[PDB]
Each structure stands twice: as structure tokens, then as C-alpha cells.
Symmetry: C3
Subunit: 337 residues, 3 copies
């Protein structure tokens, strides 16, 4: 398309919502290609990542870890206004794995505190894709400080299974998984720092061990539990988009399955089916589609069970509906031999 | 199926066999859906896992690490009686990744020492699937103490390739891979404990490093080597089911291939072909089909070679038959 | 084929070149099956792997880490002359994941210093495949000393997508990724040694932590940058072959994609498409095909970003051509 043709396209402003929720969108595209406009302000901010009160100096797109999910359709243009407020201390940028050229956009979006930039790219490939900050010389430090999220580029005709049958979800959640590398003192207790920069050298040491201290969903141990548990009902079709910008994960819905899993995150690659545990390599997003069949509590985890239950990578679903004794029944409840 | 229809299905008891062997079964289903009955007794016992006398307080379905492979067909029911003897000291349960609801069954099967339970579930999805104990709040500890196995839910019409041609194995083995996290004293010597709970805090510290001290098949270094090597013959078709309930692995048949590999373990997902090394994520089972073409010794390993040859994740096959010089020949033997 | 039939086939001698370049070859086979002849000399040599002058006692096929890429077509025979000079100190051999029997060839190729051997195998399965040394009892040590490479067995009709459409590359590069485990002294400084055997015990201790000190392409931090950046132009189709003989990796072309990726490395397994980051398990090779659409610098990384940017797993592409503002444009450049 020419500059004139792109200028002629309709514009649509989108208001982002915080993960694990996803902004309003249509599964099947409404009309022809559009220029879809998003705005995010970067916030360097202290966050608490566990019940003990462990602090991280987060670097957060739109003030959240992960950054919010942006949704467009194939061959739309994504136009992001990215703002680095003067209250921040570092240069930041953005790299979309969905985009083509200039390192995913990082080469065109280097902004110092007090600067903004507007990047437009054509969403040429359908799938879920990571985005993250990547300042030359400081790449993993920004990413593992939480400066990452994902986008979804839906096919214009919505999702289909590997054989061309439509797959329409009732609801969608975005689970961003974060590996954190928090320095410890000689007592083995987590350290706190005055400024983000004070934590650099100690943190790099931990990063080099390749062993995170915390592996969390939505920025903290237990963030998607209790009154923040995800919800569904028997019969409800749910898409769960999962990203990890730096490190492998292996998602598993305990008590359920991934009926269709785009494990590579890319919708022109046919989905795997009937999955127990799927695998998403660091630097990627994946998506699983499931129809709930049983009520009750589910745990959605990274199925390295140490990572899930010792390091924090566990979320819950609360599911309403009627129990199905055909699928599963307690023939004899625990009782004396 | 209606209530009377489910109640009318035949019930069949099956006797289990210790890994890597697999109980008798048919690849193509015999007759209509059945309720297939298994029984397992949980054993808490000390096992020795290496050549240095290193001990683990194992938590073992049916007394083995891994637990035995249960085989059913799609839309059968699996009905397990699980028994926790009063001589044990921990609560246990069971979670089948093949099952739907109640965390895979764990929510319905929490049994204290001196209790039993019976769980039934419908095997709605074909594939190999992990099962493991998962007491809330102590999940990874039970699993990395060896309390895991797998099941196979065969399609009612047996296995097929991506093009619908039947794939019929002559034999099947089940390799369960176990990551252990054994505490060491400040001299680097592995520690021993009186009771399983005594090791809990020290073990969790090791677990949190995400670095196993041992990675083994069938519960110990060299368990499937030497006089306990698996066997085959040239021309024989072998299915190798492999599971890892907690941690990634990358199986490789040294000297062979995975001709067809269901790397995700699910038979409705077409198999990869001609594989050198396949990948099974922690919390899953996979299966590889191979027709042996050369005799001699093979090594079957996790192809992180440090995990295989320093930490224990290496098995052998001994294969009989005639050497094929077309496939491979020594044109000039090692010489000065 | 019979011995007589094989003896009658045409022979072609190949001259190998240093990675990341690949020796002259045709994508579509030229004529019927041939016996393709290669020669490699093993060199035990010091390599410097970072800008701090850190040394590895490399065990290098053809003097490079990785060893060179060998290219044949399906149902050709690969005939390798392998030489272990008298100047070396250790026994070596070679195991081809592409081959069938004798552990991939290792059982037939054990050569002491001053010996040579010739191995022939039939390349029956199309794909990219790891090769590596594997002396019984010292397997991972040789591998993580850089003694590994890959081969490509092209289909006789060249590459195709999952729907039978031809995929023809303009350029091919081979990136061998290496995990190193370098001992450190009490002050955290990397140790140096004056013979390969002197490093053994210290190196095994680091290996057992499963935590590499360095993760590098082409044997060194920054190797495939600057004078060794890979090159292309807008419109050019490039195949990137990537191997890792011991440890998982997750390749990613920063600023681009893998348009078609044989993540398992096997050409009869249809490629994944539109990939952001693909996954290659330790013990395997994979290949990605991409058509460049933008000029500029690209980084090609293992997308564990600590591995890429702290431990060394980062390469560059320098791409010439016209910028495409439809694909991407700066609507407002960084400004107050
Ligand atoms: Cu990236
Ligand atoms: Cu599980
Ligand atoms: Cu190998
Ligand atoms: Cu940054
Ligand atoms: Cu940043
Ligand atoms: Cu248990
Ligand atoms: Cu060697
Ligand atoms: Cu060797």
C-alpha cells in the first residue's frame, strides 16, 4: 500500500485494559484494514511480588506487569504512541515480535525521559506475539524488570482449527509470565533498593545463574487467585494467551486440557490438540482454547511444579456449573481399608 | 451414554506389571467400551539411586518409580482402587492428566495412611498422559520423590501415521524419567534421614535451585543398562513411551531415530517423523515408534549429555540380527 | 543396494569451508545417488571465547567450533575420512545423528592420535542433523569442548513448504551454538590450563551445575558480528541452519521472523510458519527460511535474553536495500 492509501484508511482509537483482561474487540474483522491506535505510558515503579513484601523496581508499559494485550486483525496497522515521562530515569523503547524491520521497532522508538514517539507497523502475520523493551546494552535487565507484554493479531476471518472449522471463544484471558531475579543478603532474605540503578550489579549476578527467584503470573505470586481468580462456566469456551519474553514455560490447566493449542502462537501453524501440557519457548507467546466440562477450582500452572508451587507460577479458575459423573466420579470416597 | 448404559458396561480387572514393561493389552480395542479396573498400593520406602549408596525416601505408586503404565482405549473408563497402607506416614492422592475435573482426580482421592479410595474417569482423549500425586501444598515434593507414572489411552482403532496408515508395534516399553534433588552436607556428601518428613526443608532448598542432583530412568542410575537393557531385533517395531512429570527432557535413541514421534503425546496430533531428538516438556508424556534396522548396542538418553552421562539419564537397548552394510559400513577400520 | 551397486555409483569429492559458510552444493540433486566424499582432521587447540581472554581447550573437527556443515541429498552415501593427528592427545570418534547403526558411527570410528578411519553411511532421512564426538565414558566433555557440528540431507527435489510448493534459498548460513563450562578461581576469574586433560576435573564440576558460563555462536562471544556478520539484501531468501548438540536453544531473528521453520530439523515433518521464536532441543539441529523485507542490522539470538546478551548468544545480519514504510514507519520520531 502507498502512503496515500494508508492515509485513507479508517482510524480506530482503543482504550487498553489491565491484564489478565483484554480490551473489547471482534473476533472476525469488521470492515477492511484500519489503523488501530494505542497509547502507553511507561512507568518505572516499585511493585511487590510476593506476600512477604519483596520489592522490584519494575519497568512497566501502561503501569502493569505484563504490559496490556493489544488486539488487531491481520493487515491492520498498529499505531502506538509510546510515552516516557520525565519522572522516569532510563531510556526505553519497544520491540514488537509481530513487526518487520528496525529490530521490531526498537531502532525507531528510543525515548529518553520527557520524550514520546509514534510507531506504525503493518500486522502482516496472524498470531500472538511478544513485545518488550530492548535498549542496546541493557536488554535482559529491562525485560526481567517486567518490561514486556504481548499482542494478538487475529485472522480477519477469526480463529479456525487445523481443518478450517471456526473456533469462537466466549472469553479471553492474557497470562503474562515473568521470571524475576531478586538479590539476597547473607541471611538469604531479599534485598530492597532506593533507586532502580542501585539494584543493577547485584541483579545481573542473579540473572547469570539462570535461576529465577520468582516465576509469577500478572506480576506477583498469587496475583490470579482469590478475588482475582479467573472465572468460567461449564460449556464456556475460553482462550488463554500466555507469554514469556525471556524464559521457557510449560502451561497446564490442572483438571482440564488444551483442546486446541497454538503452541508456537502462530495461527497459520495448525494447533496441537488434546494437550495435557504445552510448551512456549522464552521470547514467545502461545494460545490455548478449551471448553470447560466440569465445575470447581482449577489451577493453571507452569508444570515445572517447583516453578509453579515454590516460585509462584500458579493461577486459579473458579468454574460454575453441574458436576459430570460420566466424566469423573468418586466410586468410593476416602475411607478405612 | 445414559445412566443404565454406563452401569451396563463390562468391568474388567487388569493386573499391572513393573516398568519398563507394560501389562498385556490389545492395540485395536476388543469389543465396546469397558470400565477397566486397576489397583495400586502406595509404598513409602528408602531406595538407593546411584553407585555411592545415595538414598531417597521414595513415594511409589505400586512400589515402583515410575508408577506402572495403565493402558486403556478411548472412551473406556479407568477405575482405580488406590490404597494407602497404615504403615505409611503421609497423605497421598492421584491426579490423572488424562482425566477431566477435580484437579485430575486429586480432589477426590486424598487418602491418609489406613485409607483407600476408588476413582473412575472416562478416558475421552487418546494419547499418553502423566499421572502423579499432588497433595495441596506439597505437590512438587511428592512428585520429585518419585510419585508419578503415566497412562496410555489408545485410539479404539490402534495407532496410525499422519496419512492414516496403521502403525502396529511388536513391543512397547515405558521409560519414566525422574529428577531427584538430594541434599548434601557442607563436605558435598549426600545426606541420609530417618523419616521422609525429616528431609523436607533440606530437599526444598535443593529443589528451588532448579538443578537436580540426579536425573534417572526407572528410579536409579543405570537401571535400564547392562543386564537390564531393553531388547529388540532387526525388523521389530518398538513403541517407547517416555514421561517426565516435573521437568523437560529430550529423548534420543543413539544409533537410531524416532520414525514417528507423538512429541506432545497426543494421538490426534499428527506425529513428527524421522526425528533425531524429540522434546517432552515437564508435566507430559510422549511416545516414539521405531523399526530397528541394525543389531548391536544402542543408548537411549536425555540428550542433554551432562544429564545423560553425568547425572544418570541413559538406558541401553540390545538388538539382535544381521548387520546392514548398505546402511553403514567401516570402509577403513581405525588404523595408523 | 548391494555392495556391487554401491561400488558402481558416481563419487563426488567435497571441499569443506568454515562456518557459518557452507560448501558448494545444489539444492535439487544433480543426477542419481552418489557417494559423497569428505575429509576432516581433528585439532585439539586453544580457543579464546570472550573479550576477557577466557580460554577453552577446544576439540575441533576441521579446526573450527562448530565443525563444518556437510551437505548431501537423501539416499546419497556420506563417506567420511576422519583423521586424528599424532599432535593430538586423546582418542576421538564421530557419531552422525543422520546415520543408522553403531551408535551413529562412533562404535566404528574410535581413532587414537596417529590413526585415521573411513566411515560410509546411507543418508536415508532428509533434514539437518547433529554430529559429534562421543568416546565412551567421556561423552559430554568432548561435546562441550566444541566437538560437534551438523549435516544437511536435502530432499532430492530440494526444499518444499507443507503444501508441496518449492522453497529455494539464495543464501545459507550454519550457526553452531555452544554451551561452555569454564572453571573459575576463588576471585571469580576464569582459569587457564596448558593441556586438555588438566582441565577435566574442574570442568566436570561446572558441567554438573547445568549452568554454562558462556553460550556462544561459532565458538566465541561476538564471533558472528562485525567482520563476521552474516549478510543479505531485501528480497533475498536465506536458510539459517542452527544446531545445539548438548543444550536447548530458542532462536529468534530480531526484526524478522522464521517464515518457514523446520523446528525439529526434519524435512518430512511440515514446517511451522510465521514464527517469532522457534525451539531446538539439545541434541538436535533446526532450520529456518526467511525472505528479508527490510534493510538494516538484525540481531539473531537465543531468546533467553540473559543467554543472548550476558552469556554470548548473539549474532548480527547486515542487510542492504530499500526501506519499506508500509511495513513500518516512524510517524513521530523520539521528541519532547
Ligand atoms: Cu525479543
Ligand atoms: Cu500435573
Ligand atoms: Cu548425540
Ligand atoms: Cu529498556
Ligand atoms: Cu525499558
Ligand atoms: Cu504422594
Ligand atoms: Cu573427541
Ligand atoms: Cu570424543
Amino acid at each position: 500500500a502507498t502512503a496515500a492509501e494508508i492515509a485513507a484508511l479508517p482510524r480506530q482509537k482503543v482504550e487498553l485494559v489491565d491484564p489478565p483482561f483484554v480490551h473489547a474487540h471482534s473476533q472476525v474483522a469488521e470492515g477492511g484494514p484500519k489503523v488501530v491506535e494505542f497509547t502507553m505510558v511507561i512507568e518505572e515503579k516499585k511493585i511487590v511480588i510476593d506476600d512477604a513484601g519483596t520489592e522490584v523496581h519494575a519497568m512497566a508499559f501502561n503501569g502493569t506487569v505484563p504490559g496490556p494485550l493489544m488486539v488487531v486483525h491481520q493487515d491492520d496497522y498498529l499505531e502506538l504512541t509510546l510515552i516516557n515521562p520525565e519522572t522516569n530515569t532510563l531510556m526505553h523503547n519497544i520491540n514488537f515480535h509481530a513487526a518487520t524491520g528496525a529490530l521490531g521497532g526498537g531502532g525507531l522508538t528510543e525515548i529518553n525521559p520527557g520524550e514520546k514517539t509514534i510507531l506504525r507497523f503493518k500486522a502482516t502475520k496472524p498470531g500472538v506475539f511478544v513485545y518488550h523493551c530492548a535498549p542496546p546494552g541493557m536488554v535482559p535487565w529491562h525485560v526481567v524488570s517486567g518490561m514486556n507484554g504481548a499482542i494478538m493479531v487475529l485472522p480477519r476471518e477469526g480463529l479456525h482449527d487445523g481443518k478450517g472449522k471456526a473456533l469462537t471463544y466466549d472469553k479471553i484471558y492474557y497470562v503474562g509470565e515473568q521470571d524475576f531475579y531478586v538479590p539476597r543478603d547473607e541471611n538469604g532474605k531479599y534485598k530492597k533498593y532506593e533507586a532502580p540503578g542501585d539494584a543493577y550489579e547485584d541483579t545481573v549476578k542473579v540473572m547469570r545463574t539462570l535461576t529465577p527467584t520468582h516465576v509469577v503470573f500478572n506480576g506477583a505470586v498469587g496475583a490470579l487467585t482469590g478475588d482475582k481468580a479467573m472465572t468460567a462456566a461449564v460449556g464456556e469456551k475460553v482462550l488463554i494467551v500466555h507469554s514469556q519474553a525471556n524464559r521457557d514455560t510449560r502451561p497446564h490447566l490442572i483438571g482440564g486440557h488444551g483442546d486446541y493449542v497454538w503452541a508456537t502462537g502462530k495461527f497459520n501453524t495448525p494447533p496441537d490438540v488434546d494437550q495435557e501440557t504445552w510448551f512456549i519457548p522464552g521470547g514467545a507467546a502461545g494460545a490455548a482454547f478449551y471448553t470447560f466440562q466440569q465445575p470447581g477450582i482449577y489451577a493453571y500452572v507452569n508444570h515445572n511444579l517447583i516453578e509453579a508451587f515454590e516460585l509462584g507460577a500458579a493461577a486459579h479458575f473458579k468454574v460454575t456449573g453441574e458436576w459430570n459423573d460420566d466424566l469423573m466420579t468418586s466410586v468410593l470416597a476416602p475411607s478405612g481399608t
